[PDB]
Symmetry: D2
Subunit: 318 residues, 4 copies
Amino acid sequence: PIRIAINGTGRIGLCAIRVASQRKDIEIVAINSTAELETLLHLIRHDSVHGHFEAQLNADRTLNIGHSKNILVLSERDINKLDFSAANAEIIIECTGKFNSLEASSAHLKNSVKKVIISAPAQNTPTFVYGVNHKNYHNESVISNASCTTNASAPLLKILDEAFKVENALLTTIHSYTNDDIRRARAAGLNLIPTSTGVSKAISLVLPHLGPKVTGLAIRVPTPNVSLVDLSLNFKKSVSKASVQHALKDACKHAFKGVVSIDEERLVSSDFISSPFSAIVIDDQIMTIGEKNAKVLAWYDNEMGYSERLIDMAQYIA
Amino acid sequence: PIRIAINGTGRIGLCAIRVASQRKDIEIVAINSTAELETLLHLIRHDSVHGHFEAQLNADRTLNIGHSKNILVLSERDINKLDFSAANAEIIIECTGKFNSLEASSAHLKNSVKKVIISAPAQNTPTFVYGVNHKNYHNESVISNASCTTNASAPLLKILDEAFKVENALLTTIHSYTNDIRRARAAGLNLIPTSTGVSKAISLVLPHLGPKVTGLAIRVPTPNVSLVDLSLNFKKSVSKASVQHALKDACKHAFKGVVSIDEERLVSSDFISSPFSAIVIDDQIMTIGEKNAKVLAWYDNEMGYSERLIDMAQYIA
Amino acid sequence: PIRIAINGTGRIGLCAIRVASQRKDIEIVAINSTAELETLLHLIRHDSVHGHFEAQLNADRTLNIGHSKNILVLSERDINKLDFSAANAEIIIECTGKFNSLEASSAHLKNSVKKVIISAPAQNTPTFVYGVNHKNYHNESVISNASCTTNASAPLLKILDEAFKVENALLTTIHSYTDIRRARAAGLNLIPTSTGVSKAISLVLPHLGPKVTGLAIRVPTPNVSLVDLSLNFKKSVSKASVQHALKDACKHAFKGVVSIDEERLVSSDFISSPFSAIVIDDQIMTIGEKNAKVLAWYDNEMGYSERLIDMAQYIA
Amino acid sequence: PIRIAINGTGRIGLCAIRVASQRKDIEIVAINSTAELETLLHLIRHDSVHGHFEAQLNADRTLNIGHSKNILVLSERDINKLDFSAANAEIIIECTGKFNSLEASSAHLKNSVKKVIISAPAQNTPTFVYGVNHKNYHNESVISNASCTTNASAPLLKILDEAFKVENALLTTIHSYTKDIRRARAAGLNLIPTSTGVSKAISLVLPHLGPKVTGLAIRVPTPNVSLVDLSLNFKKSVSKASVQHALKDACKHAFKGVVSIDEERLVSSDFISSPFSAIVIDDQIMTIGEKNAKVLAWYDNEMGYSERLIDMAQYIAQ
Ligand code: NA
Ligand code: NA
Ligand code: NA
Ligand code: NA
Ligand code: NA
Ligand code: NA
Ligand code: NA
Ligand code: NA
Ligand code: NA
């Protein structure tokens, strides 16, 4: 199996642990956490959003979770002292948020450690979204998995561009913040909060030909975990509700199998908690206006889709 | 004063009462409510969103609110028995939700009662949005004030069409719901996509634009303050600054008192009880390519609409 | 298998369907619902709180759920026209809220149909709480399963009275909900409400009911509620002795009914719990010789619904 | 007027600014904040809970709010460098949460500074609750105003003890929130029980009662308006009517302006911004047996406490 270590046990790290533990060709050899061991085990077992999970402590105080039966637990805040090579980790999943740059995360590249995947946008760092541009990977030692919002948006842009040619698009993310710029200085409270999110630049990293043609924003909403992306697109080729439906359905069967899904059951946001998909298209709400414009909406769990792609990327770059 | 009666004391009726009570050239002569007198008084006085409000009972058990010092309180569910004419009302603000059609609301027309404004979309009913097409009013006896969502989106459409010529637009309403199979879902804390007939609603007040627009709503569990998100494609070229400038200029002139601009980077709860039909989010205006813009605006889904209701009452009188 | 019908597909009716479908000795033979068939199916399959559940439609348009393979679906508002007898139903789980009285629910009784359990407090109706007084059943044909609040509090009152002898108690239910106060917007408010605790407890523990009273505070969270008992006892208590008395009851007389949380969990961890009450072990406290505070969680749909079916199996 | 300075502009410091600005015998001469001046002015003016407030910048970059027309704005994190004496401050309202101890806050006692009131429980610090034990104040230079919870419960305990003699009481605080493993869980939408050292807290202000009372808090995800729920056992026999009368009488007399009664059957949101330490829920008072009662009371988590903080400032200045 591919030997990985997870650095950081916030929400993303915890979800990565749970996801990676279920992949038969992964072995988690080490977790580094600011939490004491017993607290870490509690947090893995009990989750306000994703429910209960099986995890045990071995007699030797390693963790035993799924396929990963011998997980060393560390608690070293100083990246220069942290030694994942001693656990024979090959791939570091960097989930602390304290090293989100090429230079900072490169400090992990010690002795036998092969690669780092940063679970966030990272300054000066090659960025990949599984299903979108991962096949452009060329042995880079330190990469970014972008954001949950880009992982939802970028597949949809790619499908729709390949089918109808995107001339321009406007994206609104409805970002569910319950479990997650002067407007930031206020209590979130139960407010709707608009925020700029650098969509164009973010898309440019993984779809360089589209980034300059798209922009948008986020609206933060006090609901839990499940977010929605709202794409308003202008295409070169003429479109209908049916042709757009077909292009998305077909991609989910083929090039985006396991990454994009379609909801034909008229479900609501809570139905997608813990979904593994990067995006789940809201089929019945696909609409067109004029010859060349469409609106496409898609759900995503802002933790689980991203975490599944993070471990997909680990498997791929190995 | 213009003598009005309010039928229904749900959320819109209550807000209409509060608004009307503060207008010097309005007199609320009657309120018909399914609530008992004392309950009605409590609901007028204490509001979980809009706060506390001064109201008294007179000795003779009429209500006393602001400029309306002698409001008769009725409790008659049958519109054919209901007689607002006994209080010399000239205009009905129809807020019950039970008579949202021309045929049904025409039952109000008797004796002194010459006009009805329905506080909702209504079948076969002439529909007006103040600032958008109210000047086309031609003495119709029963009209609709449309919805809160249309009152926010239609002004923005008209301003931007006049400036840049709308070719197409997509409108997402983020509809605050704290106060179709998806509707069978105990909303809980769900986000809920909903079709809303945007094209038809806009066609009623901007016939030239209705066919060029569509969209939807996303119901969200926050209170009162909603947002509309317009994605527009224009004939003329645009920029953030030129869109900003067109909206700002409209708020000084033809949409004064109807559309406002937020330049202070506020959040939703800052607009609770706002009287505007829409408050443009200045800093979040954006464009892409030569011809496309995104415009967001806030609105309180009760208070903007209720202010317009009474504006329309004064105008049609 | 014992053949039951569910009348009403609100929250409690849906949860009773799901629970009953997983019990091998129960066959659901009919459901009556104001929803159209396809909508009912959707609501059984998809739940904003309890998650996704497997359910299928047969060719003949009966439902197939768990051990209940051939469920007749009805839609009849008139209790006199409605006939669960045609599916050979012995017991009705009455969950509409429209017939919460002995007189009203008696109309179910016809043919195969021998018994009704009303899923709420019902006027003039023999009331039982499983593990508290169900063994006092003497074949009554219409019974009430009381409320979710009483199913949580009555077991705890019984355990603690037997151990230490209740002199008096005050109960506060924090009731998760996602009289002029009822005209006020739910969401956005803590709402105190009287709930006739004393009377409700008197129905199932007649000696205790007069010694207790309380109220509820309605809070905008989903499903998982808490009961907060402040008790004065004749015998002396400590955290340790109270803890021990509750723990022992969970192993013995209240096994499967009351549980203890020793893991310091929070409310959302008990969503879908089958227990009538889960005691919050670390938050038990005493003061003076004679006073204790005991908290317990409960899912206000699932524990109650498990009890509903438990009671069906018992009175059969 | 009494010259005060406010250290810290979190929620409590912001409320203290607004309350103090409206007191004719107070002058706020300085505010120390981690925020830049323009951001502070924004936070004072616009509040998600208490609404909009008038505040202006003077030409000389002081703030002008209510009776405080010349407020100096500082941004010094190091308490040893911070010089409130340069603004002739007499009373420091210590609202940062970084110096909640006698030793730590005594660093404020420089040059012309006369007194410090800490807006939190503080280690080794004389603690006072206005209306409960403030008349026991004896010139102490550093004091604590306790917590918002204690400010609600202690007045009720004192009133009811004086009337009927508390033998024992059990207190549950329903705390509206917008080592203890439960704190490792993002609050989220959860109800969260927490031990809160009620007995010790009460002991500080009512030493004779602290040993007879205990309790806990349940954290609930509603904004600002909290409830205290007291279950009391008395020496003297009580009735609903006698308990009602005792509370009503105290609100007219010894607790005028501190405790009030709600006879209008209102709900939590109706008390947002209330200045009272506690608002008794009159219709929900109940007794059982001869000697036991339950009493509930509302309070705004911020405003009641902030009003008392400035009341205490005015009191100790004299
Ligand atoms: Na009517
Ligand atoms: Na105009
Ligand atoms: Na503004
Ligand atoms: Na509006
Ligand atoms: Na008691
Ligand atoms: Na304390
Ligand atoms: Na006072
Ligand atoms: Na207080
Ligand atoms: Na005062």
